[PDB]
Structures are given as structure tokens and as C-alpha cells.
Amino acid sequence: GAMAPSYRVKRMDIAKNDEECVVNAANPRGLPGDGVCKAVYKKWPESFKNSATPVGTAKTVMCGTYPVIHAVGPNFSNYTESEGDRELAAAYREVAKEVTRLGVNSVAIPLLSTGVYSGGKDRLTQSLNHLFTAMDSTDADVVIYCRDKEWEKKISEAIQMRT
Ligand SMILES: [Cl-]
Ligand SMILES: [Cl-]
Ligand SMILES: [Cl-]
Known part of the structure; x- marks a missing residue:
């Protein structure tokens, strides 16, 4: 475990992360995809x-x-x-199981379903709250990766409001 498990946010490409493992925002077919998925395919094919x-x-x-x-x-x-909200919560619970099983002390994670899977809606809060629900019982250092300047500020605010 980390000595004092934390949440942090960085605005940069998750392919450049400084953590012990990465979460890909994958498609169900294991295809290269676009956005985070394509960056992950280039770095870790x-x-x-x-x-x-x-x-x-x-x-x-x-x-x-x-x-x-x-x-x-x-x-x-x-x-x-309704059904999307249930599946988005479930994906993050399976991430927390994998992070625990691997025994890593840190993980890089993007906000799932916030890009081309968002159905054109702002899902920062929905996706981040499901991330916290799953990850809060883990003792890994969590570093959330984003690309937008306003999202960075809102994620940082949400982390700080709970400390
Ligand atoms: Cl970058
Ligand atoms: Cl997405
Ligand atoms: Cl973003």
C-alpha cells in the first residue's frame, strides 16, 4: 500500500504517467480506438x-x-x-479489484465515459463520483489524468473538498 493513500489530478497524456500501472478507457473489442485508448495503444501495443x-x-x-x-x-x-450509470459504476468496481490483485502502490486512471462515450453530456461529476466509490477502499495512490484546463480545476476542487 501507499504510506498515506492520496488522490491527485494531472492535465497531461496518461501515456506519460509516473504510476505503477495504467487504466485504459477501452472499447469492448480490444481495438486501438481513439483518445486515451489510441494513446495507450501507441505506448503499450x-x-x-x-x-x-x-x-x-x-x-x-x-x-x-x-x-x-x-x-x-x-x-x-x-x-x-439508468443502465449506463449502472455499467459505469460496475467498470470502476472491477478496476478496484484489479488494482488490489496486482499489489501496486499507485495507478494512473482516466475518467471513463467522459469523451466519445459521453453521449454528448458533461459527465465529470458522475464519472469521478463512481471512481471515488470504487477506489476509496483501496490503498493505492490514485492519479487522475485529464486534458481540459477547466476539468483539471473541477477535479482538483472535488478532491480537496473531501480532505
Ligand atoms: Cl502531454
Ligand atoms: Cl470515453
Ligand atoms: Cl478532460
Whole structure:
């Protein structure tokens, strides 16, 4: 475990993370995809061997000894708000199981279903709250990665409001 488990947020490419493992915002078919998924495919392409997994699940594949946790959030274009909310919560619970099983002291994680799977809606708070619900019982240092300047400020505020 980390000596004093924390949450932090950084605005940069998660392919440049300084953590012991990464969470990919994966598609169910293990395809290169776009956004975070394409950055992860360029950096860790070996981790896409048999990475296909259903919505609401996570599947870990090693790139060398570096673990890539492929977490499949729902595409809110296809799911109802109710069913999508359930699957987005479930993907983060499976990430927390994998992080615990791997015994890592730190993990880099993006906000699932906030980009091209958002169905055109701002889901920062919904996705971050499901991240906290799953990760709060883990003792890894969690570093959340984002690309937008306003999102960085809002994620940092949400972390600080609970400390
Ligand atoms: Cl960058
Ligand atoms: Cl997304
Ligand atoms: Cl972002």
C-alpha cells in the first residue's frame, strides 16, 4: 500500500504517467480506438493481446511487467441513463479489484465515459463520483489524468473538498 493513500489530478497524456500501472478507457473489442485508448495503444501495443472484454468489466494485460487494466465504460449513445450509470459504476468496481490483485502502490486512471462515450453530456461529476466509490477502499495512490484546463480545476476542487 501507499504510506498515506492520496488522490491527485494531472492535465497531461496518461501515456506519460509516473504510476505503477495504467487504466485504459477501452472499447469492448480490444481495438486501438481513439483518445486515451489510441494513446495507450501507441505506448503499450503488446497489452492489446486478448484485451476484448464486455461493458462494465476490466481485463488486465501485461506489457512487459507493466500492467494495463482495460476498463470498458458504457457508450451513453447506446445505453439508457439508468443502465449506463449502472455499467459505469460496475467498470470502476472491477478496476478496484484489479488494482488490489496486482499489489501496486499507485495507478494512473482516466475518467471513463467522459469523451466519445459521453453521449454528448458533461459527465465529470458522475464519472469521478463512481471512481471515488470504487477506489476509496483501496490503498493505492490514485492519479487522475485529464486534458481540459477547466476539468483539471473541477477535479482538483472535488478532491480537496473531501480532505
Ligand atoms: Cl502531454
Ligand atoms: Cl470515453
Ligand atoms: Cl478532460
